[PDB]
Amino acid sequence: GLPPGPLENSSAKLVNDEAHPWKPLRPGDIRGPCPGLNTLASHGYLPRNGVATPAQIINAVQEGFNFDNQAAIFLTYAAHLVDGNLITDLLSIGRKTRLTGPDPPPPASVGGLNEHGTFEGDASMTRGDAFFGNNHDFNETLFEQLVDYSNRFGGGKYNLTVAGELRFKRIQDSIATNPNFSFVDFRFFTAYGETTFPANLFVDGRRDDGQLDMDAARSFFQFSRMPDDFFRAPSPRSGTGVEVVVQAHPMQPGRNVGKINSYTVDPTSSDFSTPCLMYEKFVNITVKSLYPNPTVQLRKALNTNLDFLFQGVAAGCTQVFPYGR
Ligand code: HEM
Ligand SMILES: *[C@@H]1O[C@H](CO)[C@@H](O)[C@H](O)[C@H]1NC(C)=O
Ligand SMILES: *[C@@H]1O[C@H](CO)[C@@H](O)[C@H](O)[C@H]1NC(C)=O
Ligand SMILES: *[C@@H]1O[C@H](CO)[C@@H](O)[C@H](O)[C@H]1NC(C)=O
Ligand SMILES: *[C@@H]1O[C@H](CO)[C@@H](O)[C@H](O)[C@H]1NC(C)=O
Ligand SMILES: CCCCCCCCCCCC(=O)O
Ligand SMILES: [Cl-]
Ligand SMILES: [Mg+2]
Structure with a gap:
């Protein structure tokens, strides 16, 4: 189905x-690494089992939280291309599930948002790095560090100053302890934007002051639960x-090279200076790797979802076509 348009x-x-x-x-209900989609599933803005169409996710993030249309389109079709079933048009917001339908041939994993290295990645704020054994469950120790950073830099509230300090702290902890830490291309970009989402979208829209309290923070991050009488933001926004957040501690994209404390800059990575490159590498390297020589139905579904993805890409970028036209 077509990408939904902005809220009327x-x-x-x-x-x-x-x-x-x-x-x-309920038994079978899927939750993943995204507290936003998790909350929309737990309030029935998405199917409560955590399996949804791209169109359902786009309508949910807009209606539920006032996520802006362009961000909703880009993030939804990027996740769907790497983690979703392109024939069934279903994406798990968490673990791999037979509910997404018959799988395409490997190397496509259709692993849902829990799939490490596709959309989900390291230096998450309240989820551990995949190397430590769980990239998707709420983590009490990490959340207590978010609370600590909110006390130190936000006067008890999560705000963009806190995002700036915590974003950097999570990177430096992953450098120190994850010998497989990866912070390049798609993840380098999403990792920064995600730290704004609580200040922009979890703050009651009647205040919209960018100061998130720790009760509301815990309700979203841990329980996927809106505060009682929660009002969505008063206007569309995302990042x-x-x-x-970047200005607090500017970082180059890089990775650990099989050892802790070996963070090595990747000159082949996109950064904030080359946003068009990030899109080009996502479509040409990531998507094409999962579907190198697709069958005619898969190729059609890929091309359709890549067109949809490109609607979410900021103007100034040229569309790339790995399967032609
Ligand atoms: C537009 C569709 C969306 C998709 C496909 C999506 C997907 C994801 C994924 C896969 C992650 C995990 C990445 C990681 O930390 O490793 C993530 C993180 C996150 N998302 Fe979403 N998301 C979407 C919309 C939203 C919305 C509307 C919100 C807030 C209302 C939100 C808030 C967050 C936050 C706060 C995190 C970081 C969690 C953490 O680091 O602990 N997202 N998103
Ligand atoms: C828009 O929604 C608001 C809040 O629910 C409502 O009070 C108002 O009547 C609506 N206005 C229009 C233009 O539909
Ligand atoms: C949560 O994160 C901490 C440190 O980042 C880690 O030590 C722990 O094993 C994770 N999982 C649980 C169950 O707390
Ligand atoms: C975050 O909160 C702290 C303490 O209230 C304040 O100094 C800082 O200006 C705030 N930052 C933002 C971006 O609101
Ligand atoms: C992606 O492939 C297209 C040709 O299909 C090419 O024009 C573009 O420069 C490539 N982008 C990169 C280097 O990822
Ligand atoms: C999921 C994380 C992405 C959320 C916001 C990303 C920020 C927008 C893209 C770059 C912004 C800019 O360069 O002006
Ligand atoms: Cl919008
Ligand atoms: Mg992660």
């Missing part, structure tokens, strides 16, 4: 309402203020 009405409104109550997980 983007006002702050109650999204924790009678039609979208929080429910606990606004990411510039403050």
Whole structure:
């Protein structure tokens, strides 16, 4: 189905309402590394089992949180291309599931958002690095570090100053302890934007002050649960203020090279100076690696989802076509 268009009405409104109550997980219900999608599934903005179409995810992030249309399109189709089933049009917001339908041939994993190295990656704020054995569950120690950073840099609240310090701390902990730490291309970009999302989207829209309290923070990050009477943001947004996060501790894209404390800059990586390159490498290297010589139906589905992806790409970039036209 087509990418949904922006909200007709983007006002702050109650999204924790009678039609979208929080429910606990049933057996089979999938939650993953994204507290946003997790919250939308747990309020029934997405199917509660955590398996959804791209169109469902786009409508959910807009309606539930006032995520802006362009960000919603780019992030949803990028995740779907690398983690979703392109024939069934279904994506797991967590673990690999037979509910996404019959798999394509390898090396495509259709591993859901839990799949490491595709969308999900290292130096997450409240989830551990995949090397430490779990890239998706809420982590109490990490969240207590977010609370500590909120006390030290945010006067008890999560804000872009806290994002700046914590983003860097998580990178330096991954450099120190994960010999397989990877911080290049797609992850380098998403890792910065994600640290703004709590300040931009988890703050009650009647305040919209970019100061997230630790009760609300815990309710989203741990329980996938809106605060009682939660109002979504009063206007569409996603990553606004990411510039403050980068400016706090500017980092070059790089990786550990099989050892802790071996962070090596990758000159082949995109950075914030080459945003078009990040899109080109994502489509030409990542997507094409998972589907090197696709069958005619898969090729059609790929081309359709790549067109959709390109709608989410900022103007100034040229569309790349790994399967032709
Ligand atoms: C647009 C569709 C979305 C997709 C496909 C998506 C996907 C993801 C994925 C796969 C991650 C895990 C990356 C990682 O940390 O390793 C992530 C992280 C995150 N997402 Fe989403 N997301 C979406 C929208 C949103 C929205 C609307 C919000 C907030 C309302 C949000 C908030 C977050 C936050 C805070 C994290 C970081 C969690 C952490 O580091 O502990 N995302 N997202
Ligand atoms: C838009 O939504 C707001 C909040 O729910 C509501 O009060 C208002 O009547 C709506 N206005 C339009 C233009 O539909
Ligand atoms: C959570 O994170 C900490 C440190 O980052 C780690 O030591 C721990 O093994 C993780 N998992 C649990 C179950 O706390
Ligand atoms: C975060 O909170 C601290 C303490 O209240 C404040 O000094 C800082 O200006 C805030 N930053 C932002 C971006 O709101
Ligand atoms: C991707 O492939 C296209 C040709 O299909 C090429 O124009 C483009 O420069 C490549 N982008 C990079 C280097 O990833
Ligand atoms: C999922 C993380 C991405 C969220 C926001 C990314 C920031 C927008 C892209 C670059 C911004 C800029 O260079 O002006
Ligand atoms: Cl929008
Ligand atoms: Mg991660």
